[PDB]
């Protein structure tokens, strides 16, 4: 409603770095809000695509940002009559970023890893890795829970049970308010998908450089399965956290699995011990229900609500024809201990191949009426196919079925405007929360400031 679509702020990075693939707000130790931006195809030292992370200070004019430096050299350790190898070429550093307190977490979901023992090997595979930084202090640390030193032959004997070689940890990420980092790994357990949790503080105290394989005892990984419903389900494609069991001392996890049960797609809500509390199944196959998940209380009852994006849902139209437009589902948490029922609201895109619901960002309370609001991305929507971001406002009964404001892409065709979103933070300190939009196709990030209501 009250986002300013006239005077935008533009940040930008190198040509072809996919600057804007992922973004989040970052408050330093003094509370000064900055923007951290992931550019997963930034060139490294060897002039090879490695990805990179930028930390953008708030300036109404915008412009270029300084890099948040990480080590980009491949590592090798000859220990225990084995050889450990990390390969950072095309690792995609910055494919997801997230901030918590004065710490930044950026991940390289396609960092490869292999172990050599004489003639055998573990196989060179993308375990993924996340990098952690405290920009003010210069502290650095890594976390790579799916690295292993088990050889290829062993996995064959046990029928590839507990195979963490292709996790792609850091594909999606989130941090609980208590400081527990949660990594989605859609390739873990032979593309069933897994989650990895570990306190940030214990990631720093247990990391030393050059070790490559180290223990983090306070960590917790989800579990393999023999159920074919979970096969190739990419469990961990998207992740979020919320409060869904009534116990405020426990934090619950929300996980998207958009190819669950033979591309039906599903979203599950779990406790911190990965025990299943509810499961929302997809409405239509290959709709990618679960591509994106968002948690926020939209109807002002103190109970977090769930939003799920199916950017490929095909809407039924006249003459028995179908049109891929995308769809967003709203689930209102009921009073006390009860299951989340049918969707309270169905939001369906309009533009063909617009992928309405590819990204869903909690905005906070935008118009300051007492109900939290959201933004929904249609990165190839709008009449021109350039991309659109749609705002929907909260209300006592959920959300308004029609948008209050529509943000047309100020970038050229193919920018993927809206592919990444983040709101609910006041960056210019004017009392109203603001929105940042990513267009990695144009290598830029647009900042929309919220103004008093007209």
């Amino acid at each position, epitope marked *: 409603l009250n986002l300013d679509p006239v005077q935008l702020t533009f940040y930008a990075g190198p040509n072809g770095s996919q600057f804007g693939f992922s973004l989040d707000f970052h408050k330093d130790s003094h509370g000064r809000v900055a923007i951290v931006v992931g550019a997963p195809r930034t060139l490294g030292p060897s002039q090879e695509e490695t990805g990179g992370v930028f930390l953008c200070p708030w300036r109404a004019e915008g412009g270029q940002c300084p890099s948040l430096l990480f080590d980009l050299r491949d590592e090798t*350790r*000859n*220990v*225990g*009559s084995q050889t450990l190898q990390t390969f950072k070429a095309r690792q995609g550093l910055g494919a997801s970023v997230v901030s918590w307190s004065d710490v930044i977490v950026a991940c390289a979901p396609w960092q490869h890893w292999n172990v050599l023992e004489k003639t055998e090997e573990a196989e060179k595979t993308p375990v993924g890795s996340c990098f952690l930084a405290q920009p003010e202090s210069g502290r650095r640390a890594e976390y790579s829970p799916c690295r292993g030193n088990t050889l290829s032959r062993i996995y064959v004997e046990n029928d590839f049970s507990w195979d963490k070689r292709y996790c792609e940890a850091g594909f999606s990420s989130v941090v609980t308010q208590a400081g527990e980092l949660v990594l989605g790994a859609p390739g873990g357990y032979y593309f069933l998908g897994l989650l990895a949790q570990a306190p940030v503080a214990d990631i720093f*105290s247990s990391y030393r450089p050059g*070790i490559l*394989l180290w*223990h983090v*005892s306070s960590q917790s990984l989800s579990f393999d399965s023999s159920n074919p419903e979970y096969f190739d389900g990419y469990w961990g494609y998207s992740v979020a956290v919320g409060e869904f069991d009534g116990d405020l001392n426990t934090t619950e996890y929300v996980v998207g699995a958009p190819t669950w049960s033979w591309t039906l797609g599903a979203v599950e809500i779990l406790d911190s011990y990965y025990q299943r509390l509810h499961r929302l199944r997809g409405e239509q196959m290959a709709s990618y229900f679960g591509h994106s998940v968002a948690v926020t209380d939209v109807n002002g009852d103190g109970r977090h609500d769930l939003l799920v994006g199916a950017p490929l849902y095909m809407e039924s139209r006249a003459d028995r024809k179908l049109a891929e437009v995308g769809r967003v589902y709203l689930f209102l948490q009921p009073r006390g201990p009860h299951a989340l029922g049918a969707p309270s609201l169905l939001l369906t895109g309009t533009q063909l191949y617009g992928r309405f619901g590819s990204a869903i960002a909690p905005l906070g309370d935008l118009d300051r009426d007492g109900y939290n609001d959201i933004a929904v991305a249609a990165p190839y929507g709008g009449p021109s196919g350039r991309g659109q971001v749609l705002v929907f406002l909260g209300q006592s009964e959920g959300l308004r079925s029609r948008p209050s404001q529509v943000l047309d892409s100020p970038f050229p065709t193919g920018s993927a405007f809206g592919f990444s979103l983040r709101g609910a933070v006041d960056i210019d300190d004017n009392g109203y929360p603001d929105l940042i939009v990513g267009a990695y196709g144009a290598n830029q990030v647009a900042v929309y400031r919220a103004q008093p209501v007209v």
Partner: antibody
Amino acid sequence: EVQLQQSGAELVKPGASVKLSCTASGFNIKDTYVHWVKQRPEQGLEWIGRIDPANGYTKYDPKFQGKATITADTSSNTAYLQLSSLTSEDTAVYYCVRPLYDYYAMDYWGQGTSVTVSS
Amino acid sequence: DILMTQSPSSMSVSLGDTVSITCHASQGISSNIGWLQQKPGKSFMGLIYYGTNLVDGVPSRFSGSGSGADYSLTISSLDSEDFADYYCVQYAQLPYTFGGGTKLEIKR
């Protein structure tokens, strides 16, 4: 806290067998590797072998192949070291070891089990 | 197997002295070495791993250094508890192998 509580001192005859235990306290035995080390005053410290209690796979110094046998039961959270056809040279103190962070290190140690072989 | 030559076998020193134990390997091990402490009639406590990193809880007066096939353990300002046996251990290759041991004795 991490603590390795080993079995009590044993007093056996040559040719017989003994089975020392190493019970985990304040952590799951399944987490890391578990090594066994032999200590004598003259010969000093010698590495027996290791086990990964998550899967049971083991490695041994060729010198102990035959006498040492390392096992692990995650249920009782204990790791075991079996010795067979004992000899006066097997009279030593035996420690179980695990690493802190580094997968391959030797940082946490048990109190040690005292073994005496004599007729 | 890799032979770990630890020197000296023993040394007589006093409180507050700054002493250095060394450990020489038959080949390179690229800092894959640890340092241990066994107080008289007791068990072992981890001091260093990966050549330089301190085990949690150990004081900062201990410090490891070195590279290739020559490493060192240094204690700045000895304490009354530091008089004990010290061993090095390599884990670059299997089987792991230890050093002969070094005992710190009170001088008089």
